[PDB]
């Protein structure tokens, strides 16, 4: 489920921004807990000076999904590790492909 290397747990939004800015590389990413909603996670990716945050969460059936723009088909994954792999590929709908994992 959520035993991935880039999962940092309960770190603050500002702490996440710091870790990513430190690498100085577009595409560096980490996963942390939402600062106020239980069961919701944030996939953070650095791109041109900003940290793009995508909200990730489970459904009743325990499948993971990233927040999608209105009109776009949602995509589900049983394991969060497969959601990450899917987004390491180009042209998948996010600002830039997940490339440099910032491990805990």
């Amino acid at each position: 489920m959520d035993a991935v290397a880039v999962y940092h747990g309960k770190i603050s939004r500002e702490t996440g921004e710091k870790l990513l800015l430190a690498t100085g590389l577009d595409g560096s990413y980490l996963l942390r807990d939402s600062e106020s909603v239980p069961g919701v996670y944030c996939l953070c990716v650095l791109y041109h000076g900003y940290i793009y945050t995508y909200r990730v969460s489970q459904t009743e059936t325990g499948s993971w999904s990233a927040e999608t723009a209105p009109g776009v088909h949602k995509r589900y994954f049983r394991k969060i590790k497969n959601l990450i792999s899917a987004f390491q590929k180009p042209d998948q709908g996010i600002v830039i492909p997940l490339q440099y994992p910032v491990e805990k």
């Binding site: 939004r13 921004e17 800015l21 953070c44 000076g49 900003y50 940290i51 793009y52 945050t53 995508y54 909200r55 990233a66 927040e67 999608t68 723009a69 776009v72 995509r75 042209d91 998948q92 709908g93 996010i94 600002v95």
Partner: peptide
């Protein structure tokens, strides 16, 4: 003040 931008998947 904040470098965080809340994004959504586009495809």
């Amino acid at each position: 003040k904040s470098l965080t931008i809340y994004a959504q998947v586009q495809k």
